[PDB]
Amino acid sequence: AERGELDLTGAKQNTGVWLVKVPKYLSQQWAKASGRGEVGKLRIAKTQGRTEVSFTLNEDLANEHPFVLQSVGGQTLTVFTESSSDKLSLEGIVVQRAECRPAASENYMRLKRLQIEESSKPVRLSQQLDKVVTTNY
Amino acid sequence: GSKINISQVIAVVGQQNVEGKRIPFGFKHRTLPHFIKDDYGPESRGFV
Amino acid sequence: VGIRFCQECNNMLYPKEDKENRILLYACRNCDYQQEADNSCIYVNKITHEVDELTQIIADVSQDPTLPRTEDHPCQKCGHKEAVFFQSHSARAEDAMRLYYVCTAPHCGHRWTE
Amino acid sequence: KNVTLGVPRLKELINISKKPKTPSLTVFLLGQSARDAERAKDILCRLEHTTLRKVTANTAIYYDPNPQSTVVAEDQEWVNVYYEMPDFDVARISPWLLRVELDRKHMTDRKLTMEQIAEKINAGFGDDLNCIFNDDNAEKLVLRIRIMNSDKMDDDVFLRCIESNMLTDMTLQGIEQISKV
Amino acid sequence: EITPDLWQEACWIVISSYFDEKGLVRQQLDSFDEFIQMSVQRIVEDAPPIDLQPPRYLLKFEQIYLSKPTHWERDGAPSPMMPNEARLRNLTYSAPLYVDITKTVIKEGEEQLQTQHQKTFIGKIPIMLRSTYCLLNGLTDRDLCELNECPLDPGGYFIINGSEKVLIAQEKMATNTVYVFAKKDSKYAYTGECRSCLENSSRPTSTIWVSMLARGGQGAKKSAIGQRIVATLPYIKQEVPIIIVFRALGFVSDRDILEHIIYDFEDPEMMEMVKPSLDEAFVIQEQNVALNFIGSRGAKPGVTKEKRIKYAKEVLQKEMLPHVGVSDFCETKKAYFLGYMVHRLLLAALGRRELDDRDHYGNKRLDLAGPLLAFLFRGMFKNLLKEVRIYAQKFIDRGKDFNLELAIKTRIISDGLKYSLATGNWGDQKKAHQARAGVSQVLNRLTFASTLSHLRRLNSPIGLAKPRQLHNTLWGMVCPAETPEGHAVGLVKNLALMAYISVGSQPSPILEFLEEWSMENLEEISPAAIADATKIFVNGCWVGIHKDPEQLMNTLRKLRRQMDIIVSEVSMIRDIREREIRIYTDAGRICRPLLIVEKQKLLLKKRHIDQLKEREYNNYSWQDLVASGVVEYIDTLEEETVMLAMTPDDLQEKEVAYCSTYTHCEIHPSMILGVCASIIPFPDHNQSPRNTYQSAMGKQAMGVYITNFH
Amino acid sequence: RTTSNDIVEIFTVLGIEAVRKALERELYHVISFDGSYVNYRHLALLCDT
Amino acid sequence: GPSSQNVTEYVVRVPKNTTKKYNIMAFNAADKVNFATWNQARLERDLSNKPEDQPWLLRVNGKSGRKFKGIKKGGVTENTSYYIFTQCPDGAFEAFPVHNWYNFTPLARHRTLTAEEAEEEWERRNKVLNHFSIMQQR
Ligand SMILES: [Zn+2]
Ligand SMILES: [Zn+2]
């Protein structure tokens, strides 16, 4: 029992969690939802020799996201916490990695050009004046 | 002039060399991007 | 022929001979971690350098655009009468002009050298 | 093969360059060897400087405290042929063993023999390095090297150092600063 | 459809479209436009705020205001300046440079009353003609003739004191790229060259030298140790081992070190070759002693051990490979790149790769008007900030007030630009010994061909005949024929007809696309799976790996051929034999346009030729042709791994099989020659020394040169 | 009849007159290789001096 | 069986904000770490700088167990967002963005050579004898 001690109850329960990487538009939509309570549905389909994982966007959030699994044995991960009460605790061992890809093949880059334009909106360029400024000195 | 100049004008310019050896491999073991990789033929290595 | 590393401090292992049991004893001298090696080999050096280049060649070199493309000399595991031939072009590793055939099928990759 | 000529050679001759660019040394044979190709080949092999790097196929280091342990799969023959007479075996044999093998192509092409290089190893060093002589009946011309008996730096440092020392210069035959003839 | 036996008209139609849209001096005008638009803004933005004190004073900068080139007469009249008046009166052609000064006052009493000194004049920047920030832009034939300016003049030259000055592009070794070299006579056997710098904004090229120790001192225990690995680091007075530097980044476990160094753990001989360094680094087993060792051998040793700790941390943070990251937490990226650093050196040591050629002109880039003026502006803007700071401190030590109108000196920036663009000494005036000469020669006006040759010219920084030789890498990069006859053979060369030079772009959309397209990021990787995947390089720095090479390359090529978020100037490289992806975005690269061969047919169909044949009254030009995925800008880097066809009707068709996987076709074989060499007809029927002589003498041929000669 | 190309070693083994004769032969060989001939008097002068 | 055509459908929930900040570990599989050793843990600050922008420290079982040092990743999460999906009895997946990613490496626990005496074996630059027994003198 100390301030600097890390709780290890999560590792003793062998809790298994997943790591998901998503593109910026999905995270932006989830931030715009502002935690309403429902952002979408995740679908997991298992066949006789393959596993198919996909995510479905909410129809209210919009107004298919297939998931590709990745090898886990390359490196081991767990999840820890830092509280506002300064009590550190461990959640559990990461057991699976997930990668999110859009279903759009060529119509994705219509929005990607707009996103790059928004990113280059604060990119700053020099301006030309037709008449020289005579208010100096 | 010389008879070698006569031969180069009329029949064949001949094998062309750089620092003694033939044309080296500036690219990934090919003299020019037009020729196929891994070629030591006459046309691909500098012969006219 | 092969090396491994220490366990509890995760350091590089150095050899040691044993005075009592007369067995070679790989050990980390940043530790006291002692173990035997089943290989019983410490050092090998092929000075004439006849390594096997069949494991050296990447299986994806066949799908190169600017490599040659022959029609004869088919592959072994699959028929696929189309293949790529090239040389090693590795400096200081011999002087042979002998050709390295790779099958160009998308899921194959059995490479042979004749 | 060719020698340098022209402006760099003229600069090399008007100067007196302590190292030449491409030095050469034309040799004329005196008598019967001038017309015999075999005797000329003998002189060729006798003037070729042959380091141990060019003639040996590969090297290996093992650990055999028992002479009859025979960690190599096929070494038992000449070990039993030679080790019935324990030449200072009971003092020590330095269990760290050096093993090299000779490429048969480079063995035959240079027209030397395998006993004389072991003789030169035990002669140019003396009794500070034991040598084990094998037979040519085996497919691989294996040579086994062990350290002396009467004596820091453990054993691996000295063994690897002397291994490199054989591998860079022993002058098996020929004369130094002569690359090719 | 397909165009058989009609290639002669079609090729010259599309060359007509290219030369009608671009022209001949776009490598100057585009570079200067990029300098004026991005570079001065990036330089004035990436500058340290002036902090001084007592009340605290802070100064920050903002965007750039520019006007047309005017004149300051004796009475103060701001008359618009014409280039003809600049030539006649020995008058420099320039416009004032305007910023604002955001003066924020802190008196430790919540009295922050920020004042914005709007449109502050800080100096005069030169502008060269026919650029988009000059008076001659947009004028037609009639307006140019009425203004006594030649319409035939391509421009691209500055006017300093009435003398026409043109910037000749100077080549330099390519930044942020790891090389291997083998010095013949040096004590080091092999070496690695990674002359590197940040994204052309902060600090110049700082080099790193990883190298080899040759087999010396044989017979003794030195050969028993083996060939250790050594490097020399910037502002370290002597050499330093490698694993101690790896431990200096905070990675002490040598399993992780060899994991960064070795990617495949079933390679015994390479681990044997790297083993001599492990025996040498057995005296250092902790981070802080490594930092204290590497900091003790600097230029200025510290008084206390904490001083060496701080000096070593600073020199390994702010300077050690600035391009990969300087954000104080980028030690993982530095560890990965420093592993790959000598991973290439070991690959060259075992002979698995070959030694990279120095004069291969795909491994170096060109400093144009843009980068050179950016470097000059960086230097004397630092000088101007130093002058402003010292004047402000001296005048605030009294503590009366402060005024920005007289503190900023336009004199130093004006004479710096004018002097360095006039006399040719590139750099500070007092540092002319270390200043590179030969820049900004006097423009040759004997011949229009001579003028177009002098606008499009390269030069080498060499004061041995190896760099002078004509190289294989040049095919349609640099003209083979044109060479000065005198002492500068090989060094001074002119561009080809289609030699387009990269203007520069930012790699932020590149990273934005590559992160989204199923690529595992560099820090969040399994280090045991590096060897199976393919490395990703964007402007040299390692940003992660990808496990699906051809889908990534096909996606990138499909994005580029459709004018998507990737700029068509940006090039990507697939080295299959090494498993790397190299993507180059930065300026200095040199390129030529090429056709696209898909399956076994060209994408330049009859409809494109028909649209380009009636070019005008149909608003269809070269920029519309590249947007259709017909012509792709393939530079010298992608020429290492593609194929070219000499003629479609003669080679691309089906015959006795030589190849069937062509990727690109030549636009026309006669674009090899430069400006001078083009005017020679039947140059293949001549001898190459005679072509070289006449290309040298084509600049000396008199005649009419510029139409407004009177 | 055995000769060489280097000059310092043939000085250290035979003598300066052998240096004279070998320097003569090497200079004559390097000049008269391409077919251009030069008189012996200048060569003899330079080799003596 | 049922697993040959098993279909799973769960709900994704994102709460707006949590009072307790969440982060993520980084362990190499080649380190061969075990969780049965995890009986008592410490996680405190580094004191070499002398706090949020400063590298981390962690202790296992006091001084008896192994030691780690944590460093924040160099990349910024301006274009990246990582979520952790936790299993709960209600069956609805929870999606939580992480704040920072920290990299940790093990440290040796032995008599390391200090810098003030590290200069004496530099005169034996190539003259060094018996690499295998340098620790024996310490
Ligand atoms: Zn250990
Ligand atoms: Zn096959």
From Swiss-Prot, chain A:
GO terms for cellular component: microtubule cytoskeleton; nucleoplasm; nucleus; transcription factor TFIIF complex. Keywords: Acetylation, DNA-binding, Nucleus, Phosphoprotein, Transcription, Transcription regulation. The keyword Kinase does not apply. TFIIF is a general transcription initiation factor that binds to RNA polymerase II and helps to recruit it to the initiation complex in collaboration with TFIIB. Belongs to the TFIIF beta subunit family. The chain holds residues 2 to 153 of 249 of the full protein. The modification Phosphoserine is found at S126. The modification N6-acetyllysine is found at K21, K32, K121. Disulfide bonds: none annotated. GO terms for molecular function: DNA binding; RNA polymerase II general transcription initiation factor activity. This is General transcription factor IIF subunit 2. Coiled coil: none annotated. GO terms for biological process: positive regulation of transcription by RNA polymerase II; transcription by RNA polymerase II; transcription elongation by RNA polymerase II; transcription initiation at RNA polymerase II promoter. The modification N-acetylalanine is found at A1. It is found in: Nucleus. Heterodimer of an alpha and a beta subunit. Interacts with HTATSF1 and GPBP1. Interacts with URI1. Interacts with GTF2B (via N-terminus); this interaction is inhibited in presence of GTF2F1. The keyword Transcription regulation applies.
Curated annotation (Swiss-Prot), chain C:
A zinc finger (C4-type) spans 6-31. GO terms for molecular function: DNA-directed RNA polymerase activity; nucleic acid binding; zinc ion binding. InterPro entries: DNA-dir_RNA_pol-M_15_CS, Rpa12/Rpb9/Rpc10/TFS, Zn_ribbon_RPB9, Zn_ribbon_RPB9_C, Znf_TFIIS. One of its GO terms (cellular component) is RNA polymerase II, core complex. It comes from the Eukaryota. The keyword Cell membrane does not apply. Keywords: Acetylation, DNA-directed RNA polymerase, Metal-binding, Nucleus, Transcription, Zinc, Zinc-finger. Zn(2+) 1 binds at C6, C9, C28, C31. Its main location: nucleus. Zn(2+) 2 binds at C75, C78, C103, C108. It is found in: Nucleus, Nucleolus. One of its GO terms (biological process) is transcription-coupled nucleotide-excision repair. It holds the Pfam family Zn_ribbon_TFIIS. The keyword Magnesium does not apply. A zinc finger (TFIIS-type) spans 71-113. DNA-dependent RNA polymerase catalyzes the transcription of DNA into RNA using the four ribonucleoside triphosphates as substrates. Component of RNA polymerase II which synthesizes mRNA precursors and many functional non-coding RNAs. Pol II is the central component of the basal RNA polymerase II transcription machinery. It is composed of mobile elements that move relative to each other. RPB9 is part of the upper jaw surrounding the central large cleft and thought to grab the incoming DNA template. Component of the RNA polymerase II (Pol II) complex consisting of 12 subunits. Belongs to the archaeal RpoM/eukaryotic RPA12/RPB9/RPC11 RNA polymerase family. This is DNA-directed RNA polymerase II subunit RPB9. It comes from Sus scrofa (Pig).
From Swiss-Prot, chain G:
Belongs to the TFIIF alpha subunit family. The modification Phosphothreonine is found at T114. Keywords: Acetylation, DNA-binding, Nucleus, Phosphoprotein, Transcription, Transcription regulation. Phosphorylated on Ser and other residues by TAF1 and casein kinase II-like kinases. This is General transcription factor IIF subunit 1. Heterodimer of an alpha and a beta subunit. Interacts with GTF2F2, CTDP1, TAF6/TAFII80 and URI1. Interacts with GTF2B (via C-terminus and preferentially via acetylated form); this interaction prevents binding of GTF2B to GTF2F2. GO terms for cellular component: cell junction; intracellular membrane-bounded organelle; nucleoplasm; nucleus; protein-containing complex; transcription factor TFIID complex; transcription factor TFIIF complex. Transmembrane segments: none annotated. Induction: Up-regulated in response to enterovirus 71 (EV71) infection. It is found in: Nucleus. GO terms for biological process: negative regulation of protein binding; positive regulation of transcription by RNA polymerase II; positive regulation of transcription elongation by RNA polymerase II; response to virus; transcription by RNA polymerase II; transcription elongation by RNA polymerase II; transcription initiation at RNA polymerase II promoter. TFIIF is a general transcription initiation factor that binds to RNA polymerase II and helps to recruit it to the initiation complex in collaboration with TFIIB. It promotes transcription elongation. It comes from Homo sapiens (Human). The gene is GTF2F1. One of its GO terms (molecular function) is RNA polymerase II general transcription initiation factor binding.
